[PDB]
Amino acid sequence: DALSPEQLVLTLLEAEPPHVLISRPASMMMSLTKLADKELVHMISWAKKIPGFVELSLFDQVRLLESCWMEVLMMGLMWRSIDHPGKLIFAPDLVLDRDEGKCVEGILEIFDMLLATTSRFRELKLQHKEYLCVKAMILLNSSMYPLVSSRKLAHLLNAVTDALVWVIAKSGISSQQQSMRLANLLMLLSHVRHASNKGMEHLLNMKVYDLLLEMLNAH
């Protein structure tokens, strides 16, 4: 019942992570990193509150959480940035506009993906409900392996899909449009995956992940 469309969205709403203040006393990169580390703590809490997540094997939970974290941080960036073109509201005291991304090399490229991708969610007029579901789906779909308890993950993923389908339906739009809007939302996930990979490759070319693994062993 807790996975029923209306209940599942309300459950996902309450599970939303709190505002994260980095509290600043290389640096842009220090701030971004200090934030990710803080956000990852709350992301674990969040996933635990998704009905049925905790009941997957700890193997799968860790597996999903290790491969999605970047996407899920990005999806959350996009969503709070959605109403302000040219900017990226990372946190309540860390708003960066595109050009501030020229400082650090390779980052301007990524900012432009996030901004482009945000722009597209603004064009589709992404709804608060739809976003709640999409984010859940990013986590549940983040790794293929734990799917090829697998029974359980498949059923969970279908659950959130149905909820998204349900959300779109009470939109009152025709059935052709319902399918199109489902398809348009899901194709954007390819682009969030994309920006996630760019940020990861870049993150590793730098001179959080270990801190995450610590949290994961703690989990």
Next chain:
Amino acid sequence: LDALSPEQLVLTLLEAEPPHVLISRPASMMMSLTKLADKELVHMISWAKKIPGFVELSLFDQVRLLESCWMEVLMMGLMWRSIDHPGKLIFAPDLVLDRDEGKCVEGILEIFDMLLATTSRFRELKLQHKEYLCVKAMILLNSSMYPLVSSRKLAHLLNAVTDALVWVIAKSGISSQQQSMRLANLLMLLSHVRHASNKGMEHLLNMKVYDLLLEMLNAHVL
């Protein structure tokens, strides 16, 4: 309008399918794969040019899409011909590799395991020959965001192929909840193809095709 109709579209995409590519071999594994990709890229341009309306986008957008997608489209094609043989990757008619052979070159084993995992997830869903044709089209049309944010034309094209996929799934005869689930299941896979595409690109750029593609793209432009 009508040439983009669900039925005509799928048949058109069918005929547009690239020919078999014989690599014809007289570091080496990576030499083969690279010579193959280069050959495949030629035919991929032809293939896109046969997708109704592709040619009637601005040249700028055609080039944007082709440069962004070529790896995913090549991988999508790999997965599809490999789909019935677990543990293997039929790259071409004279280049079948199995998981283990991926240990030779470093970094490649990780990629093979994504490709093989993704292929298994398409074998479990029982991907249909026409579902595949539509999906591949969508990978190209969805490969770049920028040309969408002629943009009118790309959106229309992208809706067309989607409708075709929905249509294909519909005559599947399954219920409506299942039709949605299967649309959703196919599309979430695209994230994983994107993903493997990115790992291959990164790995390719670390090595000592892309320039040869830009040459092809300039010739497509002239």
